[PDB]
Amino acid sequence: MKTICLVGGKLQGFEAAYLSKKAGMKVVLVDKNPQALIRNYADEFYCFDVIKEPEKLLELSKRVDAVLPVNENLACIEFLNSIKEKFSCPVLFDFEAYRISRDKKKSKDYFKSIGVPTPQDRPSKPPYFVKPPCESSSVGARIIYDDKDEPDTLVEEYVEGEVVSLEVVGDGSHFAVVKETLVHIDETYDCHMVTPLPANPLFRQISHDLAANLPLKGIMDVEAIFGPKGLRVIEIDARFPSQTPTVVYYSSGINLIELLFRAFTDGVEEIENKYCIYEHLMFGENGVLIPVGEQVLSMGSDYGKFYEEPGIEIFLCKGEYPVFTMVFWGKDREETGAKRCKGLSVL
Ligand SMILES: Nc1ncnc2c1ncn2[C@@H]1O[C@H](COP(=O)(O)OP(=O)(O)OP(=O)(O)O)[C@@H](O)[C@H]1O
Ligand SMILES: Nc1ncnc2c1ncn2[C@@H]1O[C@H](COP(=O)(O)OP(=O)(O)OP(=O)(O)O)[C@@H](O)[C@H]1O
Ligand SMILES: [Mg+2]
Ligand SMILES: [Mg+2]
Ligand SMILES: [Mg+2]
Ligand SMILES: [Mg+2]
């Protein structure tokens, strides 16, 4: 039995913990917040700040099989980079790839350098899409309908179409492009639902090439919009993602935690077909169910399993109003929809 140490106990941490459990691994959480979101979901919880008390983490690295950073605190990531040679186990992270992926402008320069289409910068006609250069979860992302308009903000052409995610796990030499998923967006451009998509040869080749040219040793997701004039890559994020890996697990049978672990041990090779519906629903006043995105879920107080039966998993995120994360799967759309209705009827 393997043990994984996660640094970060919010949504990235949940995803990693969830898949580690599916892989039969013990989950050790480190987080500076005494009431970190997934503290009760982990098998062990150690509350400390890794920057303030690095020896505690280094000692933990002697007792676990891998350390996985699952936060986007640049201070933390940069600090871990500075001490990574001192770890007694592998650190499942690509610090160079993250340096590029975290900065949307640097990422776009990277896309351009290898001929990957990406939205036009500073268009002359509305609507414009605007976003910060270094946020996540669509924080600060908004549409602007007139040139009546902020610091180092990205201003792009608004590309209408499906938002599609693809994960790649690299071992430095081989790059495993995994499973396409559809990102369902809400009025805030946050993601409230994920479903799987059939293979797209072009997107897979593009994603392979983005990983290969680094070269990636770690995990990265690639996001593109299938726009009216073709695919446009909007961003990359070289860290363990939330939401999509659960859909990847059920739709493809691939456990991204197992794959990432393999990349830092035995290596990876390049290359199920079920349906899966993954969504978040808030239980509002008078029991009115409301779709919400990650920004809402990340404001919760306690996150863990609520219910399971065949083809149905439900997680409850406690807080001001409860948020349920619902996972449904089956052989096809029809059966999965049937499981969705059963899951909803439970609520
Ligand atoms: N140096 C650190 N040591 C331990 N845990 C950390 C450190 N930096 C961040 N974390 C934890 O990782 C989790 C995710 O952090 P991240 O900064 O990615 O998201 P966030 O929502 O901005 O976090 P916060 O709740 O601090 O605003 C948080 O629970 C946070 O407490
Ligand atoms: N140029 C664009 N045209 C249209 N929609 C866009 C554009 N850029 C971003 N979006 C929308 O905004 C959302 C968030 O943007 P983006 O993924 O670039 O930021 P992020 O917050 O770093 O995302 P992530 O949560 O994946 O870390 C996208 O999923 C998409 O719905
Ligand atoms: Mg992002
Ligand atoms: Mg995906
Ligand atoms: Mg994104
Ligand atoms: Mg990015």
> What is the SS3 assignment for 266-313?
CCCCCCCCCEEEEEEEEECHHHCEEECCHHHHCCCCEEEEEEEECCEE
Question: Quick one: 45 and 153 in the same domain?
Answer: no
Residues whose CB is less than 8 angstroms from the CB of residue 24 and which lie 6 or more positions away in sequence, other chains included: 1, 2
Same-domain pairing of 120 and 231: yes
Residues 342 and 193 in one domain: yes
Helix or strand or coil: residue 234? strand
State both tokens at 133. Answer: 């250069």
From the CA of 132, how far away is ligand 5's center (Å)? 12
Ligand 1: lining residues by beta carbon, under 6 Å? 7-10, 30-33, 36, 49-51, 71-73, 76, 298
User: What number of other Cβ atoms are within 10 A of residue 47's Cβ?
Assistant: 14
> Would the CA dihedral through 180, 184, 189, 191 be positive or negative?
negative
Structure tokens that stand for 282 in this block: 């808030």
Q: Are residues 313 and 195 part of one domain?
A: yes
Q: What is the dihedral of CA 135, 136, 137, 143, to 10 degrees?
A: 50
Token representation of residue 222? 């690639």
CA angle 29, 190, 301 (to 5 degrees): 35
**Which of 131, 135, 160, 298 to probe ligand 2 with, by most ligand atoms within 8 A of CB?**
131
Question: Which residues face 290 on adjacent strands?
Answer: 282
Task: State the CB neighbour count (10 A cutoff) for residue 318.
Answer: 15
**Strand pairing of 26-31 and 289-291?**
unpaired
Strand 66-69: give its sheet, edge to edge.
44-47, 26-31, 3-7, 66-69
Residue 84 shares a structural domain with residue 150? no
- Secondary structure element (H or E) that encloses residue 108, with its range: helix 104-113
Cβ atoms < 10 Å from Cβ of 52: 9
**Counting ligands in written order, which one lies closest to the CA of residue 6?**
1
| Region of residue 253 (left: phi > 0; alpha: psi -120 to 50; beta: else) | left
Amino acid at 201: P
From CA 49, how far away is CA 57, in angstroms rounded?
9
Say yes or no: 88 and 124 in one domain: no
**Residue where one domain finishes, among candidates 78, 94, 110:** 94
DSSP 177: E
Question: Ligand 3: distance of its center to the CA of 67 in Å?
Answer: 22
CA 237 / ligand 3 centre spacing (Å): 6
Examine the fold and report which residue of 36, 59, 94 is the final residue of a domain before the chain moves on.
94
Buried b (16+ CB within 10 A) or exposed e, 277-287: bbbbbbeeeee
CATH number of the domain that residue 189 is part of: 3.30.470.20
CATH of residue 70: 3.40.50.720
- For the CA atoms of the chain, what is the radius of gyration? 20
Distance, CA 70 to ligand 1 centroid (Å)? Answer: 9
Instruction: List the shell of residues around ion ligand 3, using CB closer than 5 Å.
Output: 136, 237
Distance of alpha carbon 214 from alpha carbon 217, whole angstroms: 9
Sheet strands (E) in the chain? 3-7, 26-31, 44-47, 66-69, 128-131, 142-144, 154-157, 162-171, 175-177, 181-185, 191-196, 217-227, 230-237, 275-283, 289-291, 302-309, 312-318, 323-330
* 140 alpha carbon – ligand 5 mean position (Å): 12
DSSP one-letter code for 91: B
Long-range CB pairs of 237-240 (<8 Å, 24+ gap) are 237/101, 237/102, 237/136, 238/94, 238/97, 238/98, 238/100, 238/101, 238/102, 239/12, 239/69, 239/70, 239/72, 239/93, 239/98, 239/101, 240/12, 240/15, 240/16, 240/68, 240/70
> Cα separation of 267 and 87, whole Å?
20
Residues 53 and 127 both lie in one domain: no
- Contact in structure between 66 and 56 (CB atoms under 8 Å): no
Specify burial of residue 134 (Cβ count, 10 A radius: 0-12, 13-18, 19+). middle
For residues 84 and 101, membership in a common domain is answered with: no
Q: Does one domain contain both 203 and 269?
A: yes
Q: Could you tell me which residues are beta bridge partners of residue 166?
A: 222
Ligand 2 centre and the CA of 213: distance in Å? Answer: 23
**112 carries a ligand binding annotation:** no
Task: Find tokens 């969705």 and name the residue.
Answer: 340
Cis peptide before 151 (omega within 30 of 0): no
User: What Å distances lie between residue 192 and 195, 232, 244, 292, CA to CA?
Assistant: 11, 22, 11, 5
For the chain, count helices (H), then strands (E).
Answer: 10, 18
How far apart are the CA of 286 and the centre of ligand 4, in A?
35
> Which residues are near ligand 4, the ion (C-beta closer than 5 Å)?
165, 167, 181, 244
| Residue 31 assigned to a binding site | yes
Nearest ligand, CA 139? 2
Q: 3-state class of 15 per DSSP? A: helix
271, 303: one domain: yes
Partners of residue 219 on adjacent β-strands: 169
- Ligand 2 atom with the smallest distance to the CA of 190 is 13
How many angstroms is the resolution?
1.8
User: Which whole-number Å values give the CA distances from 247 to 86, 254, 277, 289, 341, in the listed order?
Assistant: 35, 10, 7, 22, 18
Q: Which residue's CA is the closest to the ligand 1 atom numbered 2?
A: 49
* CA-based nearest residue to 179, from 236, 233, 222: 222
Q: Is the dihedral of CA 302, 32, 98, 81 positive or negative?
A: negative
Domain boundary among 94, 129, 152: 94
Inter-residue contact 28 to 64 (CB < 8 Å): yes
**Residues 14 and 134 occupy one common structural domain:** no
Provide the Cα torsion 133, 192, 272, 24; round to 10°.
80
Q: Which two tokens stand for residue 256?
A: 């991204």
Peptide bond into 123 cis (omega under 30): no
DSSP class of residue 229 equals T
User: Could you tell me if 38 and 106 lie in one domain?
Assistant: no
Domain count, the chain: 2
As a whole number of Å, the end-to-end CA separation of the chain is: 35
How were these coordinates obtained?
Answer: X-ray
114 within 8 A of 209, measured Cβ to Cβ: yes
Domain around 58: 2-94
Q: For atom 28 of ligand 2, which residue has the closest CA?
A: 189
Pocket of ligand 2 (CB under 6 A): 119, 129, 131, 135-138, 141, 156, 158-159, 163, 183, 185, 189, 223, 225, 234-235, 237
For a pocket test of ligand 1, which of 7, 10, 47, 50 has the largest count of ligand atoms closer than 8 A to its C-beta? Answer: 10
d(CA 303, CA 39): 8
Q: Which residue's structure tokens are 């059966």?
A: 335
